[PDB]
Amino acid sequence: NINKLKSSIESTNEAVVKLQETAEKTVYVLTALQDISSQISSMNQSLQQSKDYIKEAQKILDTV
Amino acid sequence: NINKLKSSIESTNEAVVKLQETAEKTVYVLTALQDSSQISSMNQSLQQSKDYIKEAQKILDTV
Amino acid sequence: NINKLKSSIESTNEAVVKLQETAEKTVYVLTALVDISSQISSMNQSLQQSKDYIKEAQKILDTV
């Protein structure tokens, strides 16, 4: 149960890291608008991963 | 405390889902731009993220 | 351990708050397309802190 929480929290954290990775690409593209398409595809990749990680976190947490 | 932690985490995770939704719309607009309501939509989802995280901290304080 | 879980999640929540601050600056910039540069600069600062906070979260969590 304690282990249950830890494993779940870990997925939440990776989900957050994925959002941070996505947010840094945002800064790059916004800067630029003053390669972008490959940055956009990249954002999509890390965003889907964030979503994948959060669903896992939620799936686990439910087990508590 | 275990049940309180759980209840607190659920809000955190909801907060993250909202940011992801906010990031979805961000990607849309950026994609649109390199080829107003999307914006209104970002605000709604971001504010819910705030409410969720706020709630998470409140329950967390009871632990 | 519960004291530790609370400690790590605490940091996790801080990180989320910083991502929210970064998202707020993004909406502003997207709406401007104000002070894009300044705006894009706060985004970066906000994101960095978020990053610092998640790493502290991951660190504490490992103590569980």
From Swiss-Prot, chain A:
It comes from the Viruses. Residues 1-21, 39-64 form a coiled coil. Glycans are attached at residue 44. It is found in: Virion membrane; Host cell membrane. The inactive precursor F0 is glycosylated and proteolytically cleaved into F1 and F2 to be functionally active. The cleavage is mediated by cellular proteases during the transport and maturation of the polypeptide. Belongs to the paramyxoviruses fusion glycoprotein family. Homotrimer of disulfide-linked F1-F2. Class I viral fusion protein. Under the current model, the protein has at least 3 conformational states: pre-fusion native state, pre-hairpin intermediate state, and post-fusion hairpin state. During viral and plasma cell membrane fusion, the heptad repeat (HR) regions assume a trimer-of-hairpins structure, positioning the fusion peptide in close proximity to the C-terminal region of the ectodomain. The formation of this structure appears to drive apposition and subsequent fusion of viral and plasma cell membranes. This is Fusion glycoprotein F0. It comes from Hendra virus (isolate Horse/Autralia/Hendra/1994). The lineage of its organism: Viruses, Riboviria, Orthornavirae, Negarnaviricota, Haploviricotina.
